[PDB]
Amino acid sequence: QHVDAESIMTAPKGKLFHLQFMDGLLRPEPSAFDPPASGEDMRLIYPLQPISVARSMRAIVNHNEVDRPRGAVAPSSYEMDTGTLSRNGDLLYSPVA
Amino acid sequence: LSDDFKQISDPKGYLTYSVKYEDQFTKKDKLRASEADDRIVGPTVNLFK
């Protein structure tokens, strides 16, 4: 789906539309022998938030053979810790140190 | 008796997982393990293909 720069100036105040953002971290680059390019892409919009709150882990593919690809994250040491019950009621954590 | 709450076999949960695969990144090493080596750590491998 692609929107226009004229409609982004006339959209009603309380009507929330969705506008998708492209990734592109895992994309194989072109071969050595192929046609070149001429004066390319111009992007016109940018979020200032940032727009990524749900992550956990990203791009689970290896680079070369033994290292992380530039800009990839692993799961946090919190969703991987089953604690114990409280002294009486609910749930606890580690405890640390 | 009144019967307030009803019971279930397996719990659901509020927060679940999602994924977007890239259908061109396949490793050429079909690995293998035992059957109990499979079951416990089984469906979790097929959510992180």
């Binding site: 290896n62 070369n64 690809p69 | 396949t26």
Partner: peptide, 27 residues
């Protein structure tokens, strides 16, 4: 079963030309 015999074997060799794949490996 009746007469004791003797047989022979030779380890076989199998190879095809290196096939073409369309799936990429690393980033």
């Amino acid at each position: 079963a009746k007469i004791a015999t003797a047989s022979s074997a030779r380890q076989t060799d199998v190879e095809k030309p290196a096939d073409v794949t369309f799936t990429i490996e690393n980033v």
